[PDB]
Design an enzyme around this catalytic site. Structure first.
Site, mmCIF file in Angstrom:
data_model
loop_
_atom_site.group_PDB
_atom_site.id
_atom_site.type_symbol
_atom_site.label_atom_id
_atom_site.label_comp_id
_atom_site.label_asym_id
_atom_site.label_seq_id
_atom_site.Cartn_x
_atom_site.Cartn_y
_atom_site.Cartn_z
ATOM 1 N N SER A 23 0.873 -1.057 0.026
ATOM 2 C CA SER A 23 -0.283 -0.383 -0.287
ATOM 3 C C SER A 23 0.498 1.531 0.382
ATOM 4 O O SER A 23 2.062 0.805 -0.271
ATOM 5 C CB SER A 23 -0.739 0.296 1.496
ATOM 6 O OG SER A 23 -1.228 -1.428 1.766
ATOM 7 N N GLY A 24 0.256 2.492 -0.025
ATOM 8 C CA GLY A 24 0.878 3.541 0.721
ATOM 9 C C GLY A 24 1.611 4.615 -0.675
ATOM 10 O O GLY A 24 0.830 4.151 -1.933
ATOM 11 N N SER A 25 2.370 5.398 -0.481
ATOM 12 C CA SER A 25 2.807 6.372 -1.509
ATOM 13 C C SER A 25 4.300 5.499 -1.239
ATOM 14 O O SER A 25 4.128 4.495 -1.427
ATOM 15 C CB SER A 25 3.404 7.324 -0.647
ATOM 16 O OG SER A 25 4.892 7.761 0.612
ATOM 17 N N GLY A 75 4.192 3.875 -3.952
ATOM 18 C CA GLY A 75 3.483 2.642 -4.770
ATOM 19 C C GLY A 75 2.976 1.453 -3.955
ATOM 20 O O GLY A 75 2.748 2.022 -3.115
ATOM 21 N N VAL A 117 2.573 -2.637 -3.917
ATOM 22 C CA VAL A 117 3.029 -3.396 -4.607
ATOM 23 C C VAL A 117 2.485 -4.690 -4.448
ATOM 24 O O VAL A 117 1.632 -5.786 -3.829
ATOM 25 C CB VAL A 117 4.266 -3.850 -3.549
ATOM 26 C CG1 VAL A 117 5.088 -5.400 -3.615
ATOM 27 C CG2 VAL A 117 5.224 -3.124 -3.862
ATOM 28 N N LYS A 132 6.380 -3.974 -7.843
ATOM 29 C CA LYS A 132 6.354 -2.021 -7.071
ATOM 30 C C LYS A 132 5.525 -1.214 -8.732
ATOM 31 O O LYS A 132 6.621 -0.885 -9.187
ATOM 32 C CB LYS A 132 7.314 -1.459 -6.299
ATOM 33 C CG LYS A 132 6.452 -0.444 -5.552
ATOM 34 C CD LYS A 132 7.437 -0.370 -4.500
ATOM 35 C CE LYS A 132 8.766 0.246 -4.625
ATOM 36 N NZ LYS A 132 9.986 0.180 -2.804
ATOM 37 N N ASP A 159 16.419 5.008 4.915
ATOM 38 C CA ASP A 159 15.012 3.525 5.937
ATOM 39 C C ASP A 159 15.225 2.022 6.001
ATOM 40 O O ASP A 159 14.152 1.841 5.716
ATOM 41 C CB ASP A 159 13.743 4.183 4.217
ATOM 42 C CG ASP A 159 12.561 3.706 4.945
ATOM 43 O OD1 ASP A 159 13.052 4.091 7.049
ATOM 44 O OD2 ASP A 159 11.718 3.487 3.990
HETATM 45 C C1 LIG Z 1 4.695 -9.801 1.503
HETATM 46 O O1 LIG Z 1 5.932 -8.645 0.547
HETATM 47 C C2 LIG Z 1 6.305 -9.181 0.099
HETATM 48 N N1 LIG Z 1 6.555 -10.697 -0.114
HETATM 49 N N2 LIG Z 1 7.863 -10.991 -1.057
HETATM 50 C C3 LIG Z 1 7.914 -10.199 -1.609
HETATM 51 N N3 LIG Z 1 9.289 -10.110 -2.515
HETATM 52 C C4 LIG Z 1 9.749 -9.054 -2.851
HETATM 53 C C5 LIG Z 1 9.291 -7.409 -2.309
HETATM 54 N N4 LIG Z 1 9.904 -7.306 -2.747
HETATM 55 C C6 LIG Z 1 9.046 -5.177 -2.931
HETATM 56 O O2 LIG Z 1 8.345 -4.739 -1.253
HETATM 57 C C7 LIG Z 1 9.775 -4.220 -3.482
HETATM 58 C C8 LIG Z 1 9.536 -4.281 -5.297
HETATM 59 F F1 LIG Z 1 8.495 -5.358 -5.842
HETATM 60 C C9 LIG Z 1 10.190 -3.500 -5.758
HETATM 61 C C10 LIG Z 1 11.618 -2.601 -5.640
HETATM 62 C C11 LIG Z 1 11.755 -2.699 -3.894
HETATM 63 N N5 LIG Z 1 12.791 -2.526 -3.548
HETATM 64 S S1 LIG Z 1 13.753 -0.697 -3.945
HETATM 65 O O3 LIG Z 1 12.922 -0.868 -5.342
HETATM 66 O O4 LIG Z 1 14.496 0.090 -2.692
HETATM 67 C C12 LIG Z 1 15.097 -1.621 -4.308
HETATM 68 C C13 LIG Z 1 15.864 -2.540 -3.090
HETATM 69 C C14 LIG Z 1 16.622 -3.376 -4.026
HETATM 70 C C15 LIG Z 1 16.735 -3.972 -4.392
HETATM 71 C C16 LIG Z 1 16.339 -3.631 -6.278
HETATM 72 C C17 LIG Z 1 15.056 -2.766 -5.955
HETATM 73 C C18 LIG Z 1 11.055 -3.706 -3.290
HETATM 74 F F2 LIG Z 1 11.429 -3.457 -1.862
HETATM 75 C C19 LIG Z 1 8.100 -7.732 -1.881
HETATM 76 C C20 LIG Z 1 7.300 -8.951 -1.149
#
Ligand SMILES: COC1=NN=C2N=CC(NC(=O)c3c(F)ccc(NS(=O)(=O)c4ccccc4)c3F)C=C21
Length: 260
Positions: free
Chosen positions: A18-20, A22, A24, A36, A129
């Site tokens: 959710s949220g700002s 973006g 997911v 995301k 963060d």
């Molecule tokens: C319940 O939620 C979830 N359960 N399994 C999951 N697996 C991946 C998840 N990914 C994410 O939450 C997610 C994303 F989709 C895109 C970018 C970044 N960070 S970013 O864009 O800061 C970035 C940081 C490091 C490397 C690449 C991008 C993220 F943290 C969320 C999950």
């Protein structure tokens, strides 16, 4: 090479984020992935160029402890696609489902996070963060830091950051402080300042150094060398905080000094 994923290849599904910054979704593109979507209602160049510049940062990362960037989309919406971590975020384990980890495990989670952070810093990247919600615990054994650089994380802000004093309060040591809070999370099992119910007072006090984590809740089996390091990362004066190579060193040492 370049990581732009063409329209219609990805398949967005069940919603989670959710949220700002973006929303997911769990999706599929060559396997389960996370997607995301920035939902910025179609840039707006060159926002479209500011986005590409962030993806430039992600693609500098290749380390088991840093969440795997798999590619980005611009076609339907702006979007960033990562590996899909099976398991729950560290925040979820500690605070939602109250998972009880062996102290040996707790130190290792701490070690890994420190490992991935040392790496991010090695490659001149400030997370801005760090916190348990951004430390995903994949297949329940491996750490994946994600989610890079003002309400959902005042608990991890160093004083210099909280009291928005100048343009860039953010520094390796501002991360080291956030690391120090998640250390407190691991060791106390709680979030800091659980007994102060007014969030503004917290912001005020922590910024003036009247308030600080009550380190006397590190559970009994917490190595003193850990409790000391915890306090070292939390120093109110940001220049007194260790950097991650040294943080990592201390954790690795107090780690091999434990199982016997
Ligand atoms: C319940 O939620 C979830 N359960 N399994 C999951 N697996 C991946 C998840 N990914 C994410 O939450 C997610 C994303 F989709 C895109 C970018 C970044 N960070 S970013 O864009 O800061 C970035 C940081 C490091 C490397 C690449 C991008 C993220 F943290 C969320 C999950």
């Amino acid at each position: 090479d370049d990581w732009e994923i063409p329209d219609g290849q990805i398949t967005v599904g069940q919603r989670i984020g959710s949220g700002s910054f973006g929303t997911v979704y769990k999706g599929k593109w060559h396997g389960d992935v996370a997607v995301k979507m920035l939902n910025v209602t179609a840039p707006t160049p060159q926002q479209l160029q500011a986005f590409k510049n962030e993806v430039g940062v992600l693609r500098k990362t290749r380390h088991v402890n840093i969440l795997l960037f798999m590619g980005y989309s611009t076609k339907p919406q702006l979007a960033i696609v990562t590996q899909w971590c099976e398991g729950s975020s560290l925040y979820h384990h500690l605070h939602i489902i109250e998972t009880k980890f062996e102290m040996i495990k707790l130190i290792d989670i701490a070690r890994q996070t420190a490992q991935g952070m040392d790496y991010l810093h090695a490659k001149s990247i400030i997370h801005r963060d760090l916190k348990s919600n951004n430390i995903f615990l994949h297949e329940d054994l491996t750490v994946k830091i994600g989610d890079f650089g003002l309400s959902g994380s005042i608990l991890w802000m160093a004083p210099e950051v909280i009291r928005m004093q100048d343009k860039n309060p953010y520094s390796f040591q501002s991360d080291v402080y956030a690391f120090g809070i998640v250390l407190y999370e691991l060791m106390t099992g709680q979030l800091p300042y659980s007994n102060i119910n007014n969030r503004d007072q917290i912001i005020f006090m922590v910024g003036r150094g009247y308030l600080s984590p009550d380190l006397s809740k590190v559970r009994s089996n917490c190595p003193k060398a850990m409790k000391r390091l915890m306090a070292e990362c939390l120093k109110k004066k940001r220049d007194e905080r260790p950097l991650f190579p040294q943080i990592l060193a201390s954790i690795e040492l107090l780690a091999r000094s434990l199982p016997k």
